[PDB]
Structure formats: structure tokens, C-alpha cells
Design a protein around this ligand. Structure first.
Ligand SMILES: Cc1cc2nc3c(=O)[nH]c(=O)nc-3n(C[C@H](O)[C@H](O)[C@H](O)COP(=O)(O)OP(=O)(O)OC[C@H]3O[C@@H](n4cnc5c(N)ncnc54)[C@H](O)[C@@H]3O)c2cc1C
Ligand SMILES: Cc1cc2nc3c(=O)[nH]c(=O)nc-3n(C[C@H](O)[C@H](O)[C@H](O)COP(=O)(O)OP(=O)(O)OC[C@H]3O[C@@H](n4cnc5c(N)ncnc54)[C@H](O)[C@@H]3O)c2cc1C
Lengths: 494, 502
């Protein structure tokens, strides 16, 4: 029961940490995972007829700089096996009443969207001391400043188009920090085929007996006797020189709350430092969610792999923008316009057309908080799911030269065979999708507190513990490498 | 004759400087201009049937932050005049063999173009700075690094597509600094209608008797008796407390040469300070050119106002990229290919503005770059040769825009007319490379250039009395009309406040 290093969590951060420790000659380590599987928020599920889908992470982002992707790419150069596809495409944008709205010669929405993004960059990325605000408020500020140079249809539709950013963060635009909204992407993203192959390679790169599944860690204690004690729910006790904690930010947040009996919650003694505890006030957790619609066969146009459905907009909104004297006045007018039920048209949805990129007759749809929570709470009511998404699904088919969807879950018409829904908001070992900023948040606080450790022996890794690739699989992966490398170096000094 | 301020040059920098002096109550100033007109590199010309075109600057750039543009926009709110139109559009890209190549579900050229530009940003914004190279060299590196993630057609057409940036700098991709190639476009640009209204509104805002046209300044002397003496070509001598020199960088560059006989050259006594002379080695001058094609009427598709014809590309290039081991071998393989013809309309990218969609005028405004510009400008009076040169791209554009080949109807006596076909009526060409008072288009970076040196040396002045304004003297809006406008305001405000305080 005496270990060099114990890693809590077998997601990509934990797996890479173990892989790195082995690579550096470190022996007698343990990876403790609460689930009966490795991978954490990397999970590939099976659906209709053995079709595979990533229900967690699915893209390699930032392929110009992503060190994890580059490893996959180099392997692919050496054996010629396909591990990923570049599915970056020209976005189709769909409004309920107007239909297709992308690449329009009069609307030119993509062009004003870039100006909007330039506006956002200029608001923050030249200055210092600028107050943060919601993404919604930033768009309203843009419209107010540029209305003289925008058509009515541009004012109506542009705010709904730019909300695709909600699906980068997993948050509604009024919940989302403007300051953190517009980050740069370092090149195209590559769709993983699939992430389980990445997980399995890393998992196989260290001794297989290090791994302990179905092992929920319940407490971690530092005796002044240097060593760290790790208590598991099964009553097992371990003693380690070092400890790398990779549980999600959301699960870690449970430690600073009194209720002990929460699933996933780790009791720290001595308690997590105030800098760590206070950092939870300045960073939050988004809820990107996924729904997979599996069809019998593709009878729609494969013009694009990328399709976004726009939430409904109004002409009354345009009149309000043109008539408002200032931001404050704009806020008042929009409130009185507001004063129904959430539908599939209440928010933007991002649909990936897998038929074009992978040859599979399915759509992978991304949704955001607060929709994600409501949908995941009914993930087993398939009739109710179909009735909710039916209007957007039918509008999509229409715009893709096809016809209305037929419910075949129990000609050239699309037949829906199965629906798969994510569970991240309800799973106690993830409790949401990934770290995300509300207006006023400062992610650098958490990253600093996390990467400086609780003490020299108690360390942290994971998507929420690093700057580059923050929120992303490659950031989690790098953070794991980081902590293991540090510990490797300290261990050889003995 | 004794003057408070003498301004050399009546371009927008010089005009705004004079406007500013008058606005702040300064009297007895002079604007000495070598040409028989004001406006400098702002010039609106008249063509077929009274159609007007800006043959110099035509866009308000960076409309999010452009202070000249924002003043224009405020004026239109005030007086109901149309001064501009937003003509940013989705680019139509045309290759001679394949036809339209834009927004293509297989090629997706715009997407990898975006990636290349991100690659460029990453290349020159790491903490460790790197050596500059040509835009060409940068593009090749991208292809060599990213070939695993690019299809054959992407490798073939992308490098031709990206060369649209040649028409922003007025420079061939092998002549252009990669470091300065990708800069920030702060919002959409607005097409001016036209820049002559801008010139007239500033020109009319100071006393007309301040202006002296056809007045070439030949020397500027700072008497150790403290004032500045300005000598003109005709022999007229002037004395001033302050002088604002706004002649182009290309003309100012002549001052380091000894032969006084060079047209437009100004003799400085004492000579331009070493920090100024040295800055000329770290900045150069591009040659953006223009050709206007005027048609009888629009019989082409108005899907977009923005059209770019790509220079010819080969599948052989793709094979070379796929088979190269490193950068050195890639250069050798390309240089052999380059060794194994004449210059044509397909030897370089050309940027065509379709004025019919944005302005309702049945004409195209085409932009060209060095080395092509000076060659075309040299034959500007030979319409039939001009037509013959551009005929293949004009025809390819018409086909791609659902029309027919172009008819030469440039001679009125011939009574040429047609319904279905595009009838060319007139061709207008710029002359900025052969005009001694411009000698090119605007400041531009060769690889290794650092424009900061010139801007600093210019903004600090030759001394307290001898100041500089113009597009080449300012960081924000460098090269641009609004940079020149702001620089004029800058030097005049400085002098004006100084004079007020006495
Ligand atoms: C829907 C969705 C889509 C995403 N899309 C992308 C994408 O396209 N591209 C991308 O790069 N990233 C994406 N992400 C983000 C990415 O998945 C995360 O950044 C990354 O998976 C986080 O990995 P991690 O190792 O840091 O944490 P995890 O992968 O969650 O691993 C932490 C492990 O700790 C374990 N654990 C928790 N508590 C205990 C305990 N008490 N005792 C023992 N073990 C415990 C958990 O079981 C978990 O497996 C997406 C995420 C979601 C949810
Ligand atoms: C083809 C072309 C297209 C362009 N497109 C754009 C565009 O789209 N948008 C944009 O913002 N800018 C554009 N520009 C750049 C823009 O025109 C310049 O940045 C701006 O006009 C410079 O003005 P200036 O007053 O600084 O110099 P100028 O306008 O050249 O004025 C300097 C004056 O000095 C006078 N002079 C020279 N020598 C003497 C002398 N020896 N004695 C007395 N007077 C002398 C000259 O006659 C000249 O009129 C373009 C330029 C060209 C050439």
C-alpha cells in the first residue's frame, strides 16, 4: 500500500500523467477511477447498427499548435491509418421563416460577423481596466455603435448568427462572459475517429495493473509525516509520496462545501487552501450537451457538414435597435418586448452532418445551457425528444432538398431510427461539460491556484488547470504531462 | 513674403493641415503644390458618358476606427448626402481553366486561407522573433508544414488565392515582406463616392488665396537666423516660421541623391538628419495601379462586387510539394520549374471591382501590382494593346458571370452596339509610377523592412520648424488616406497651439 504517485481520475489528464511517469522510469504508481471505464469526458458510445459516436469531446481543436493532435498525425503518417478527418466546412445557417441565410448576396451576414468579432477584439484586446459584460450585451453594444452601417435584415439576423459561439462554451449568450467569448482558434479543427482510440493508446502506455476502476476516492490527507494518505470508498487505504488530482472542476468544488456524502466529493485534510477555495468564485462550469439523431439512410444534400439553426428573431427587435438612444434605453425597451415556452427555435443549435464527412447517416447536434439540462433530464423519453426537435429537423431536411422526418424509432423520406443523448449534467463524476466563464469571471485565478498545487505533494491536473487548451482535451492532456514531469524530476533527486 | 506656415503639397495631408490652421484662427499661410490641381493621390476622373472614377484612393479603410470615415458618416447624418457605400462582398475567385473556385464544397479554399493567415500570425508573434522573408516564402512553408492536411487542389489553388494580398500592398508576393503582409482590417471598408468630395470639402475650408498651384518647391533652408526659406522652381522665394512638408516618401527619398535636376526633388540645408536618411533603407514604396473598364450597360450577373482572377497554376506544383523533403529541396525543385515565357493577364492575380452591383455603374475597376503596374501604365495611351492584353481575363469573367465574350466598341464612329453581349466603350489607366510627383502608389514593406523607423523620424520632424506629414509619417492608417489626413491635423494642431501661446 506504499506508492510513489497516485493519480485520481482516468480521464485524459490522468492517463497522460501515468503514461509520462512510466516514460520517465517511475514505478509503483496507481490510477484510481470512480467509473468502471477510463476516458472521463472522452467517451465513445454505440448506437443503431453498431454506429460509433463521441458523446463527449469529438474534435482535435487548434491543429496548428495542438500537441496531442500532432502525435496522432505523426502516427497516421507512419502507418496510414485514418484517425481523424478535417471536417471544417462552409456553415449553412437556417432561420425558421426565411430558410437558408448563409452566403447571401444581400444579407452578407458572415462579413458583418467578422466585423463584430473585430469589434470585440478592439473592445478588450488593446485595453486594460475594461469592465466585462455578457456576450449578449456586447452584441447589443455593437449594433448600437454600427446601426448606421447595417441594414434592417442585418440587424435582425446577425445577433442570432453570432450565437454559434454559445456552442463553443456550452452557455447561453446572456450567461456568457464577453471578455472570454472570442478566443482565437489556431487553425482548423479535426474530427476524431474516434477519441476512444486516443484514450486506449495512452491507457496502454503504462503498466495495466496501475489502473483501479470502480474506485471512488473519498478523502485525501497530508500528515506532517510528508506522505499523503488516500482513502477509497471500498475501505482501501493507500500511502503515496505524491498525488495528482484530475477530477473535474465541478467535482472538486464539492470539497469546499460541508455536505460529505456527495458522489465524487473528496474530503481534504488539511482543507484546500483559501486561494483555491476562493478561485471557485471566479470561474464556473458550462453545459455543452449532445444529441445524436440516427437515420436509416442519407436522403439529404451533403453540401455541408456544418449546419446551424438560428433562434427566432423579430422585426420589432430591429425597430427597437434603431430607435433606442443608448444602451440603457435599449435594455428597457427589450424587456417590455419580452413581457412563452422554450422550443427548438428558442436558441441556436449546431448540427453536424456526419454523412458528408464520415459517410454515416446521422446528425450530431450540440446544445447549450440552459437547454442542455432540460434535455438531459428527459433523455429517456424518446417520443418527447422527437416532438421537441421535430420542427428544426424538418426545416433542415427541407433546406437540404429532402422531406419531413418519419418517426421509425419503434421512399426518399428520412426515417429516424434512434436518438442518443449525453448525460454529463446528471453524471456525478462530471457534473457539467467543462470550465466556462460567466461575466466577471477570471479563469487565470483557478489556473494559477491549480498549477501551484495544494502543497508540494498534492497536485492538480485537468482541463481547468491550464491556460493553453483551457477546456480542451489537449489542455487536459498537457496538464497531465506537466504534473508528471515535475514529479518525475523531484523523484530522481532522491 | 513673410508667412506663419508654409505647407508643401496639397494632397489630403496638406489640405487638412491648412484646414486645421484656418480652423484655429491662424492667418497668412500658404499651400504650395507642384501639380496644376489639388488632391495628390486622391484624384477622381471622368470617363465615358460622364461616369466618374477614383483613379487613386477609392475606399475608406478600417471603418470601425477610421476617424476620417467617422467624420464623413457624421456629415451624412447631418446633410443627407450619400458619400460612400459598403461594398464588402463575398469574393468570386476565377481560375482560367476551372472557372469559379470560391465557396466550393470540395476546395474550401477560404477556410485554409484563414488557416494560413493564422499560421502567419503564429510565425511572427512567438516570444522569439524570427527573420522576415517574402510572402511567397511564407506560403511555401505553410504548404510544406501542412501538406498532410491539404488535398491536391487545395495545394494547387490556395497559394494563388492568397495572393489577393498583393492588391493590398501593390507588390508581387516575392517582393513583399511576409511580416507586413497580414495586418488587421478594423472592420469593413467603404467605397467612397467619391474622394473628390472629400478633397473639395477640406480644400474649401481655408482661404483660396492660400493655394499656389504649379508651384514646385526645389529647396528648403533653415537660416541660422532662425526662420525657414522656401525656394520655388520659378524663382519665387518665401519666408516662414514653420513648414509642413507632405510630399510623398518616394519624392522625399530624392533628397538623399545629389542631382538637383530630379523633378520634385527638394534641396535641404542643412541636410535631412541621419536618422531620417537611414530610415529610407528600412521602408520602400509599392505600385498599386488601376485600370477602369467601361461598358455600355450591365449584362452580367451582379452576385458580387468583388472578383479576383487567380494567376495560372499547375498540377506539377502539387506534385513538387508532395515530393519535397525540406525547404531547400522545395526551392530547388521550384526554381527548375520556373526556368522551364511572356507576361500575360494570367501571370498574376488581378482584383476586379464590379461597380454595377454597388454603384449601378456599368464598369469594372481593376487593381494591379508591381511589376505589372509600370508596364501597363507605360502603354496607357494604347487602347487596342490594353484591350488585347486584358481580353482573356475579361472574357473569362463574363463567362463565369453568365455572360458572353466582350465586344470592342471603343470607337464611336463605328456605331458598335449589341443587346446580349458586353460592349466595351473605354479603358482608363492610372499613371502613378510615371508621375514624378508620386513615383509609385504608397509606402510598402520589402522583406526586412521596418516602417517604424520612418514614422518615428518623420513624426519627430527635421527640426522644430521643419515638419513632415503624409501617409508615410504615421502608424495608424499608414499608407492610407486617413493616415495622411490625421498626420496633417497632427502637425497643424501642434503648430497652431504653439502660435496661440505666443
Ligand atoms: C459534450 C462535451 C463536448 C466536448 N467537446 C470537446 C471537443 O470537441 N474537443 C476537445 O478537445 N474537448 C471537448 N470537450 C472537453 C474535454 O472533454 C475536456 O476538456 C476533457 O475531456 C477533460 O478531461 P480531464 O481528464 O481533465 O477530466 P475528465 O476527463 O473528466 O477525467 C477526470 C476523471 O476523474 C474521475 N473522478 C471524479 N471523481 C472521482 C473520485 N471522487 N474518485 C476517483 N475518480 C474520480 C472521473 O470519473 C473522471 O473520469 C468536450 C466536453 C464535453 C462534455
Ligand atoms: C492607386 C492608389 C490606390 C489607393 N487606394 C487607397 C484606398 O483605397 N484607400 C486609402 O485610404 N488610400 C489609398 N491609397 C493611398 C492614398 O492615396 C495615400 O495614402 C494618400 O492619398 C497620401 O496622401 P498625402 O497627402 O500624404 O500625399 P499626396 O496625396 O501624394 O500629396 C502630396 C503632394 O505633394 C506634392 N508635391 C510633390 N513634390 C512637390 C514639390 N516638389 N513641390 C511642391 N509640391 C510637391 C504632390 O503634387 C502631391 O500632390 C491609394 C493610393 C494609390 C496610388
Amino acid at each position: 500500500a506504499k506508492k510513489k504517485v497516485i493519480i485520481i481520475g482516468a480521464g485524459i489528464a490522468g492517463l497522460k500523467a501515468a503514461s509520462t511517469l512510466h516514460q520517465n522510469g517511475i514505478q509503483d504508481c496507481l490510477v484510481l477511477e470512480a467509473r468502471d471505464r477510463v476516458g472521463g469526458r472522452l467517451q465513445t458510445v454505440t448506437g443503431y447498427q453498431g454506429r460509433k459516436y463521441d458523446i463527449g469531446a469529438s474534435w482535435h481543436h487548434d491543429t496548428l499548435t495542438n500537441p496531442l493532435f500532432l502525435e496522432e498525425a505523426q502516427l497516421s503518417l507512419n502507418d496510414g491509418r485514418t484517425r481523424f478527418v478535417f471536417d471544417d466546412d462552409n456553415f449553412i445557417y437556417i432561420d425558421e421563416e426565411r430558410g437558408r441565410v448563409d452566403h447571401d448576396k444581400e444579407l452578407l451576414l458572415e462579413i458583418v460577423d467578422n466585423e463584430m468579432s473585430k469589434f470585440a477584439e478592439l473592445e478588450f484586446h488593446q485595453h486594460l481596466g475594461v469592465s466585462d459584460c455578457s456576450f449578449f450585451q456586447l452584441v447589443m453594444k455593437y449594433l448600437l455603435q454600427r446601426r448606421q452601417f447595417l441594414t434592417n435584415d442585418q440587424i435582425r439576423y446577425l445577433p442570432q448568427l453570432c450565437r454559434y459561439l454559445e456552442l463553443w462554451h456550452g452557455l447561453d449568450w446572456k450567461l456568457l462572459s464577453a471578455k472570454d467569448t472570442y478566443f482565437g482558434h489556431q487553425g482548423r479543427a479535426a474530427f476524431a475517429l474516434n477519441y476512444d482510440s486516443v484514450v486506449q493508446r495512452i491507457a496502454q502506455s503504462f503498466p495495466q495493473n496501475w489502473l483501479k476502476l470502480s474506485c471512488e476516492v473519498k478523502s485525501i490527507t497530508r500528515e506532517p509525516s510528508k506522505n499523503v494518505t488516500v482513502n477509497c470508498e471500498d475501505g482501501t487505504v493507500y500511502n503515496a509520496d505524491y498525488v495528482i488530482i484530475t477530477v473535474p472542476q465541478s467535482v472538486l468544488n464539492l470539497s469546499v462545501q460541508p455536505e460529505k456524502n456527495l458522489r465524487g466529493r473528496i474530503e481534504f485534510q488539511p482543507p484546500l487552501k483559501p486561494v483555491i477555495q476562493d478561485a471557485f468564485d471566479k470561474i464556473h462550469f458550462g453545459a455543452l450537451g449532445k444529441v445524436i439523431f440516427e437515420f436509416e439512410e442519407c436522403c439529404w444534400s451533403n453540401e455541408s457538414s456544418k449546419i446551424v439553426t438560428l433562434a427566432n428573431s423579430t422585426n420589432e427587435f430591429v425597430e427597437i435597435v434603431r430607435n433606442a438612444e443608448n444602451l440603457d434605453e435599449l435594455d428597457s425597451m427589450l424587456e417590455r418586448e419580452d413581457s412563452t415556452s422554450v422550443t427548438c427555435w428558442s436558441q441556436p443549435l449546431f448540427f453536424v452532418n456526419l454523412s458528408k464527412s464520415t459517410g454515416v447517416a446521422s446528425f450530431m447536434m450540440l446544445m447549450q445551457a440552459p437547454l442542455t439540462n432540460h434535455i438531459e433530464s428527459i433523455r429517456e423519453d424518446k417520443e418527447r425528444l422527437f416532438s421537441f426537435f421535430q420542427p428544426v429537423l424538418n426545416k433542415i431536411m427541407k433546406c437540404l432538398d429532402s422531406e419531413d422526418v418519419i418517426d421509425g424509432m419503434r421512399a426518399n423520406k428520412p426515417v429516424l431510427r434512434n436518438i442518443i443523448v449525453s448525460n454529463w449534467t446528471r453524471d456525478p463524476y462530471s457534473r457539467g461539460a467543462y470550465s466556462a466563464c460567466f461575466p466577471g469571471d477570471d479563469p487565470v485565478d483557478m489556473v494559477v491556484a491549480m498549477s501551484n498545487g495544494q502543497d508540494s505533494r498534492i497536485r492538480f491536473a485537468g482541463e481547468h488547470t491550464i491556460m493553453d487548451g483551457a477546456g480542451c482535451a489537449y489542455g487536459a492532456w498537457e496538464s497531465g504531462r506537466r504534473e508528471a514531469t515535475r514529479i518525475s524530476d523531484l523523484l530522481k533527486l532522491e
